[PDB]
Design an enzyme around this catalytic site. Structure first.
Site, PDB file in Angstrom:
ATOM      1  N   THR A 135       0.818  -1.204   0.000  1.00 47.36           N
ATOM      2  CA  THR A 135       0.000   0.000   0.000  1.00 47.36           C
ATOM      3  C   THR A 135       0.852   1.255   0.000  1.00 47.36           C
ATOM      4  O   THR A 135       0.400   2.308  -0.461  1.00 47.36           O
ATOM      5  CB  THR A 135      -0.933   0.004   1.204  1.00 47.36           C
ATOM      6  OG1 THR A 135      -1.613   1.262   1.276  1.00 47.36           O
ATOM      7  CG2 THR A 135      -0.146  -0.215   2.477  1.00 47.36           C
ATOM      8  N   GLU A 244      12.065  26.833  -0.133  1.00 47.17           N
ATOM      9  CA  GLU A 244      13.472  26.992  -0.478  1.00 47.17           C
ATOM     10  C   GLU A 244      14.103  25.712  -0.997  1.00 47.17           C
ATOM     11  O   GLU A 244      15.034  25.783  -1.804  1.00 47.17           O
ATOM     12  CB  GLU A 244      14.247  27.486   0.730  1.00 47.17           C
ATOM     13  CG  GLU A 244      13.568  28.638   1.390  1.00 47.17           C
ATOM     14  CD  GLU A 244      13.180  29.684   0.385  1.00 47.17           C
ATOM     15  OE1 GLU A 244      14.089  30.298  -0.206  1.00 47.17           O
ATOM     16  OE2 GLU A 244      11.969  29.877   0.168  1.00 47.17           O
TER      17      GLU A 244
HETATM   18  N1  LIG Z   1      12.769   2.739   8.474  1.00 43.87           N
HETATM   19  C1  LIG Z   1      11.678   2.058   8.803  1.00 43.87           C
HETATM   20  N2  LIG Z   1      11.161   1.147   7.916  1.00 43.87           N
HETATM   21  C2  LIG Z   1      10.058   0.450   8.235  1.00 43.87           C
HETATM   22  C3  LIG Z   1       9.432   0.641   9.445  1.00 43.87           C
HETATM   23  N3  LIG Z   1       8.368  -0.177   9.492  1.00 43.87           N
HETATM   24  C4  LIG Z   1       8.308  -0.879   8.339  1.00 43.87           C
HETATM   25  N4  LIG Z   1       9.360  -0.504   7.558  1.00 43.87           N
HETATM   26  C5  LIG Z   1       9.684  -0.972   6.210  1.00 43.87           C
HETATM   27  O1  LIG Z   1       8.511  -1.149   5.456  1.00 43.87           O
HETATM   28  C6  LIG Z   1       8.822  -1.993   4.376  1.00 43.87           C
HETATM   29  C7  LIG Z   1       7.607  -2.787   3.909  1.00 43.87           C
HETATM   30  O2  LIG Z   1       6.422  -2.033   3.994  1.00 43.87           O
HETATM   31  P1  LIG Z   1       5.536  -2.242   5.302  1.00 43.87           P
HETATM   32  O3  LIG Z   1       5.303  -0.917   5.967  1.00 43.87           O
HETATM   33  O4  LIG Z   1       6.239  -3.216   6.203  1.00 43.87           O
HETATM   34  O5  LIG Z   1       4.141  -2.852   4.819  1.00 43.87           O
HETATM   35  P2  LIG Z   1       3.231  -1.946   3.875  1.00 43.87           P
HETATM   36  O6  LIG Z   1       4.006  -0.741   3.426  1.00 43.87           O
HETATM   37  O7  LIG Z   1       1.989  -1.555   4.625  1.00 43.87           O
HETATM   38  O8  LIG Z   1       2.849  -2.900   2.648  1.00 43.87           O
HETATM   39  P3  LIG Z   1       1.913  -4.171   2.917  1.00 43.87           P
HETATM   40  O9  LIG Z   1       2.575  -5.112   3.893  1.00 43.87           O
HETATM   41  O10 LIG Z   1       1.671  -4.872   1.609  1.00 43.87           O
HETATM   42  O11 LIG Z   1       0.606  -3.687   3.482  1.00 43.87           O
HETATM   43  C8  LIG Z   1       9.933  -2.893   4.880  1.00 43.87           C
HETATM   44  O12 LIG Z   1      11.025  -2.789   4.007  1.00 43.87           O
HETATM   45  C9  LIG Z   1      10.334  -2.329   6.219  1.00 43.87           C
HETATM   46  O13 LIG Z   1      11.724  -2.177   6.280  1.00 43.87           O
HETATM   47  C10 LIG Z   1       9.943   1.553  10.337  1.00 43.87           C
HETATM   48  O14 LIG Z   1       9.392   1.722  11.411  1.00 43.87           O
HETATM   49  N5  LIG Z   1      11.069   2.264  10.018  1.00 43.87           N
HETATM   50 MG   LIG Z   2       2.015  -3.457   5.051  1.00 43.88          MG
END
Ligand SMILES: Nc1nc2c(ncn2[C@@H]2O[C@H](COP(=O)(O)OP(=O)(O)OP(=O)(O)O)[C@@H](O)[C@H]2O)c(=O)[nH]1
Ligand SMILES: [Mg+2]
Ligand SMILES: Nc1nc2c(ncn2[C@@H]2O[C@H](COP(=O)(O)OP(=O)(O)OP(=O)(O)O)[C@@H](O)[C@H]2O)c(=O)[nH]1
Ligand SMILES: Nc1nc2c(ncn2[C@@H]2O[C@H](COP(=O)(O)OP(=O)(O)O)[C@@H](O)[C@H]2O)c(=O)[nH]1
Ligand SMILES: [Mg+2]
Lengths: 427, 97, 45, 426, 92, 427
Positions: A135, A244
């Site tokens: 998403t 900026e």
């Molecule tokens: N830097 C950072 N990356 C995060 C964090 N939480 C999740 N991610 C990254 O998010 C990426 C994948 O997307 P997710 O947020 O886990 O899941 P999504 O974006 O909702 O996509 P879906 O699982 O299909 O719903 C992974 O590569 C994780 O490294 C966070 O708190 N900090």
């Molecule tokens: Mg997700």
């Protein structure tokens, strides 16, 4: 001057859960929502005695959003703002771009205007997403597309999270990242890259927490966001607003990818010993050991730089330190930029979160530069995209969602054209 | 060097000699928190290992102590202005509202 | 330029410190001046 | 009688104007509440040049503060001597240019300059005999440079006969804040050479230099720099405000320093400037003022005159002084280094004496040297502008607005022929 | 003795008059779906309203207004505590 | 004016352990790091009410380093200024010069650069090491070599702990000592030898301590170091800087080896006993019963002498005493240096440590001279090197770490060349 922040994806709203914790602690807002003018760019003064943020979380799985609803900030966020779908996209650009978005995106952009209408002097939108997910990539691109159609001239700052080179949590994130960046090219105005190994190395090297969770990552990412909006919120000697960036950091309209950095990332005890001065933190923000993206600007040439300063700083010494960097030859600026710097000074020192690991500091720097090491990043990601695509692995997932190979080919060659562009400018 | 014994007489007094003249006053053990700091730390760690709550998600386990801790002594860090080396005072360039 | 900047600070500190030290030193010196002046009585014409 | 109306543009213009009005109010003794509290009746006779009597001794300045961001406005109202400006004179936009000359000159001017022209036209037609306009602004920012440039153009087309000063700061490669410094500076200068009557060039690099060497301060904040530029502005228009043995109005200075209508870029110095530690160990003689005024490290521009020629020069003096010593010291500095002065003009030094010193002082001075070392600064800027425009850096932000390429070409052309003519008369 | 603490609390909130009506707003909003509030939440609300009461006193209030069948100090009945606080408010 | 000090090896940081206790006592700095400008050359001020030394302890075994980290001086030392490896070099030059040195020296060189930048008027470096071991000799010489290629012109005052002829605590120390000096020649500008048997005889003879340990040695060595940097720290009637050892005492680019001496070494009760004046302490500083290196200057000829005086000393009597010395014919000078004396006078008397065996004295003298009995020392050590080297004893250790036979042979002949040089200059 007001700015609203939208968060796409499970990483997005965890970044938001740290940013808004930092904002409330900065302006002394209780987690209930009320204090016991400077805040106006983030919080509206609802009704009577209650500040409700200018934000929309949106996600497709209901788990993490409902966790926000039951967390500490149950009342600190307006109930309608936290949108949430019924089923996730599950690491799939196509599923997140054609199946579920067509239902949730119309309600979302109907609710962002119901926010921009309450706004009067909207500085811009700023988005938070991880392109690795489903998403975050698909629906995120669908939202960014209809944002560009609806407003267009307003700036859309972007803080994205690319997949790291070797540490990774997924497999199809190459496909997801590529099919996302085809829209991330021509739809966002400014885009800041945020990798996770770089942040892991910082928390391991400097802050020496041997076992960091995502919370510490989100904490110092919020430090970065807070430090580059502090010029709108608080007052300084030489302030730079959100406009900026698109003026002084993007020499050509298709090149907006900016490495970030922060210093000093220092624990409680190392604060007592290091005498923090402006010179050495201006040095510290430039080593590859203290950047927010695992790349090396030694391989690259700085196309421009922005230096945000917070705290006990005078324009004298910051101008002295920036002189030393300009005269040093370890790092090399591009020929076409004679004055490749832009300084911004703010007086409000950066606050600490109790239970956080950073200490009470007098001064801090947030550097945002543009270089060609990012053209190295995209190529290293393209290499392993074509590695999978040569065997047509995982492709049946996307074609099953209804897509084809056309956008695969055109996204592949779009990245190729971007590498050609980056090697050109870097001449 | 730490002068663990209260009375700092001499370097060679702590060494073992043949003679009872000094052997009586050689100290055997240095008891104090200056030594026991490590066991204090690791016993706190063993206590928090022994006593644990199963249903504490990390996301919310981090925030709750923070929201309590800032509530305990609420101080808002006011804008500090560096005093220029003159009779003139900064009078900053911008002001929010 | 960091050397040239810190030079200024060290010079300023040592300048004002010298002022303090000399102000302290002046009073005993003036005392000795007064003592040995007392020995010599001027003449009457 | 002769009227000076004030114009401030941008954040630099507002803060300079804030310290300038603080110092002038100190000179005429008017308190930060707005009432006269001085002793000598010399201060009553020449406050119509700057103020307007409201009622019961309320004198409000005749200034127009113009900007695009409320941060400057609130910083003006908050400081001391802030409650003395009339709020009607705070003409003030809301979007903000932000380091974009095109926004400052084409998009935001269209809806702001009508309101500023309303205020300034009301402020000018309010008093009888205008001496001239005063403008202090910056050449780095947008709403200072861009809007200020548009206002300069519209004014010079509206009120043509009146005089006009322009104090402009030029960003230097040593003290370089922004990135589009050349793209702003070159376009602004291209307009100043045809519209402004005379321009006096400040530079923050030279000011930091002076506050390090002469004043020997450790932390030179902007307040001290604004204090120096204010001392310059006061020393310039002192003769209109106080009677002297040899008066000199702005038009008198202009006719004695501008031999050719395109050579109106001066450099400025100020004296005496001594650290508070070295404040006891100094004498106060006209020689002690001249030896520091003619010193090359005392100029408020980044142009070493020993790399060029003094085309003309001028020196304004304050304090009860001996004209004989004034003229003989001018002669001595004129006859000693006969190589630094142009040949086809003898007696290159205009001089003036006013008998009122700045408060806290006995004897001061001000210097305005129309030199051909200023084309060092213009080359130092035009080389960076060529370095970018050869290669269309940042160009899309100016092209997608209404500005096109030929504006840059003609800006380069006028920059080149101006440095060409300054180089000719060297 | 928890009733003395409740009386001291209503007398403390008699001053800074906005702080009384603010506290009943807290117990309603920060409530659970059922009228139960965690011990940490109750302590946080009192500190946020700015009332300082001894931790032993907070424990006494929790024991008096504890939900039935829970551990001794783990939770608190927000509805019962609020309906009991209204009485001392109108009596003071 | 500032100077930084590095300590290498097990002996190095035990010596600095004494040295920094003394500095804290002299400038009145509590072991928690704050006072309850003369300190500026050793302790930098951090923020408000803190002082953090300009020093680095380093060692490959973490045992004695973290003994410092858990001592009383926890807050005083910067957490990262105590460098510590993971495993010992174990009396092995090659192991401590190529295996572990290559990974520890880059970290120490970056740290020293940080200290230098935080310095302003750097006088030079002064090092503390023992050449008999592996850590001090191996990566000592490595760090000395890399400091020379980095700064070079800055003087390096090296206080090295050479082995005694018959008293010895190792077996392969001759191999280590020759391999260490082989680079100590062309990299240390001014090298002062410090033996152990000589100080054992001093602590037995004058302080009449019958069973001394290392802490006594380190404490009075610290007293010597503080006595020769006291001229930089405090104002004197005739003060000499660290640059003048380089000039007044080094007649040839490869004759830089000095015999140090210090007087009066007197306990508490003998202070009441003895009438201390300048004539007798100037006399006492010359007989071999008060030299810090076991050799007989009666067999050699002096080249150049230097004398620090601390306390209530007038230039008059010191001139009389040196005049009586030069006219005394028990000791003899070389013909190529008729004016072979150097004087320096500082006002402050030397302070005492609680628990130390040195009494409160009005005046003290530290003599640093050059002779040719040092040429006798190197021959005495060279002969016992050849005795083992003929049979190729212990060689398999070094060549297993990575070196070969060439370094042994070339170091042997280089000490032969130095032997010939001392014999030639002695003529
Ligand atoms: N830097 C950072 N990356 C995060 C964090 N939480 C999740 N991610 C990254 O998010 C990426 C994948 O997307 P997710 O947020 O886990 O899941 P999504 O974006 O909702 O996509 P879906 O699982 O299909 O719903 C992974 O590569 C994780 O490294 C966070 O708190 N900090
Ligand atoms: Mg997700
Ligand atoms: N004078 C004096 N000498 C010491 C002290 N500590 C060690 N030494 C000398 O150091 C020599 C051997 O080197 P060590 O310091 O023990 O060890 P090292 O030099 O660090 O080499 P490694 O053992 O491999 O780490 C011995 O001959 C001792 O005489 C001390 O505190 N004072
Ligand atoms: N002397 C002086 N220079 C200033 C001041 N404020 C900003 N500047 C300089 O002006 C340049 C930026 O101009 P800016 O204030 O942004 O112009 P504006 O945006 O049109 O208001 C920077 O290079 C600053 O160094 C000030 O108060 N005094
Ligand atoms: Mg060892």
């Amino acid at each position: 001057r007001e700015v609203i922040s939208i968060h796409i994806g499970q990483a997005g709203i965890q970044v938001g859960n740290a940013c808004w914790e930092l904002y409330c602690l900065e302006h002394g807002i209780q987690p209930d929502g009320q204090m016991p003018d400077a805040f106006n760019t983030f919080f509206s003064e609802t009704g009577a005695g209650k500040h409700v943020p200018r934000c929309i979380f949106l996600d497709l799985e209901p788990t993490v959003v409902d966790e926000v609803r039951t967390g500490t900030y149950r009342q600190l966020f307006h109930p309608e703002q936290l949108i949430s779908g019924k089923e996730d996209a599950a690491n799939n650009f196509a599923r997140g771009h054609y199946t579920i978005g067509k239902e949730i995106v119309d309600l979302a952009l109907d609710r962002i205007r119901k926010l921009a209408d309450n706004c009067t002097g909207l500085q811009g939108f700023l988005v938070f997403n991880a392109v690795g997910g489903g998403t975050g990539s698909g629906l995120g691109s669908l939202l960014l597309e209809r944002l560009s159609v609806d407003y267009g001239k307003k700036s859309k700052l972007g803080f994205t999270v690319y997949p790291s080179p070797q540490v990774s949590t997924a497999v199809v994130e190459p496909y997801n990242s590529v099919l996302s960046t085809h829209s991330l090219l021509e739809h966002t105005d400014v885009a800041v890259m945020l990798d996770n190994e770089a942040i892991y190395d910082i928390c391991r090297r400097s802050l020496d927490i041997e076992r960091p969770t995502y919370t510490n990552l989100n904490r110092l990412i919020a430090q970065v966001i807070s430090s580059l909006t502090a010029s709108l919120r608080f007052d300084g000697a030489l302030n730079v607003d959100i406009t900026e960036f698109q003026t002084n950091l993007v020499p050509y309209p298709r090149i907006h990818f900016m490495l970030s950095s922060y210093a000093p990332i220092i624990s409680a005890e190392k604060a007592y010993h290091e005498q923090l001065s402006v010179a050495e933190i201006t040095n510290a923000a430039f080593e590859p050991a203290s950047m927010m993206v695992k790349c090396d600007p030694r391989h690259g040439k700085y196309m421009a730089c922005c230096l945000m300063y917070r705290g006990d700083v005078v324009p004298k010494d910051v101008n002295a330190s920036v002189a030393t960097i300009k005269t040093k030859r370890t790092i090399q600026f591009v020929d076409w930029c004679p004055t490749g710097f832009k300084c911004g000074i703010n007086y409000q020192p950066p606050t600490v979160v109790p239970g956080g690991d950073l200490a009470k500091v007098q001064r801090a720097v947030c550097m945002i530069s543009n270089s060609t090491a990012i053209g190295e990043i995209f190529s290293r990601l393209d290499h392993k995209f074509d590695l999978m695509y040569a065997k047509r692995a995982f492709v049946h997932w996307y074609v099953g969602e209804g897509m084809e190979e056309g956008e695969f080919s055109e996204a592949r060659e779009d990245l190729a054209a971007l590498e050609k562009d980056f090697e050109e400018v870097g001449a | 060097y730490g002068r663990a014994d209260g009375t700092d007489r001499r370097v060679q007094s702590y060494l073992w000699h043949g003679r009872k003249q000094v052997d009586y006053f050689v100290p055997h053990s240095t008891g104090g928190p200056s030594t026991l700091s490590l066991t204090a730390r690791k016993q706190q760690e063993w206590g928090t290992q022994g006593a644990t709550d199963a249903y504490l998600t990390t996301k919310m386990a981090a925030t709750q102590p923070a929201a309590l801790a800032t509530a305990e002594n609420p101080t808002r860090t006011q804008t500090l202005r560096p005093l220029g080396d003159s009779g003139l005072m900064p009078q900053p360039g911008q002001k929010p509202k | 330029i960091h050397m040239t900047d810190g030079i200024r600070r060290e010079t300023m500190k040592k300048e004002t410190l010298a002022r303090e030290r000399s102000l302290a030193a002046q009073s005993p010196y003036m005392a000795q001046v007064a003592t040995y002046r007392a020995r010599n009585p001027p003449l009457d014409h | 009688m002769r009227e000076i109306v004030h114009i401030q543009g941008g954040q630099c213009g507002n803060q300079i104007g804030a310290k300038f009005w603080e110092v002038v109010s100190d000179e005429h003794g008017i308190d930060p509440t707005g009432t006269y509290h001085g002793d000598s009746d010399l201060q009553l006779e020449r406050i119509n040049v700057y103020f307007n009597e409201a009622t019961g001794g309320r004198y409000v300045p005749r200034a127009i503060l113009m900007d695009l961001e409320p941060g400057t406005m609130d910083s003006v109202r908050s400081g001391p001597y802030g409650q003395i400006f009339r709020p009607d004179n705070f003409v003030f936009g809301q979007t903000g240019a932000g380091n974009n000359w095109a926004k400052g000159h084409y998009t935001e001017g269209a809806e702001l300059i009508d309101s500023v022209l309303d205020v300034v036209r009301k402020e000018a037609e309010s008093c009888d005999c205008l001496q001239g306009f005063q403008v202090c602004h910056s050449l780095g920012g947008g709403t200072g440079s861009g809007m200020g440039t548009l206002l300069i153009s519209k004014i010079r087309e509206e009120y043509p006969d009146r005089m006009m000063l322009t104090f402009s700061v030029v960003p230097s490669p040593k003290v370089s804040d922004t990135v589009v410094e050349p793209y702003n500076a070159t376009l602004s200068v291209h307009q100043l050479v045809e519209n402004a009557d005379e321009c006096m060039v400040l530079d923050n690099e030279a000011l930091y230099d002076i506050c390090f060497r002469t004043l020997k301060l450790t932390t030179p904040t902007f307040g001290d720099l604004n204090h120096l530029i204010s001392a310059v502005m006061s020393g310039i228009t002192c003769c209109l405000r106080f009677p002297g043995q040899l008066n000199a109005d702005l038009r008198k200075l202009a006719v004695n320093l501008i031999p050719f209508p395109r050579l109106h870029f001066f450099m400025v110095g100020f004296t005496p400037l001594t650290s508070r530690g070295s404040q006891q160990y100094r004498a106060l003689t006209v020689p002690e003022l001249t030896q520091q005024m003619w010193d090359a490290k005392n100029m408020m521009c980044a142009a070493d005159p020993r790399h060029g020629r003094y085309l003309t020069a001028s020196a304004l003096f304050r304090g009860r002084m001996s004209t004989k010593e004034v003229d003989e010291q001018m002669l001595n500095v004129q006859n000693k280094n006969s190589s630094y002065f142009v040949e086809w003009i003898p007696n290159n030094v205009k001089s003036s004496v006013c008998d009122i010193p700045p408060k806290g002082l006995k004897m001061s001075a001000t210097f305005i040297g129309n030199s051909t070392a200023i084309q060092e600064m213009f080359k130092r800027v035009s080389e960076q502008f060529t370095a970018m425009f050869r290669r269309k850096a940042f160009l899309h932000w100016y092209t997608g607005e209404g500005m096109d390429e030929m504006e840059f070409t003609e800006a380069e052309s006028n920059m080149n022929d101006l440095v060409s003519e300054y180089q000719q008369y060297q | 003795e928890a009733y003395s603490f409740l009386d001291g609390l209503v007398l403390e909130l008699a001053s800074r008059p906005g702080s009384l009506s603010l506290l009943e707003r807290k117990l309603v909003t920060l409530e659970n779906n059922q009228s139960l509030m965690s011990a940490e939440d109750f302590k946080l609300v009192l500190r946020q309203v700015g009332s300082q009461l001894p931790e032993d006193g907070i424990a006494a209030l929790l024991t008096r207004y504890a939900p039935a069948g829970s551990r001794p100090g783990t939770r608190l009945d927000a509805a019962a505590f609020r309906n009991d606080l209204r009485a001392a408010s109108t009596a003071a």
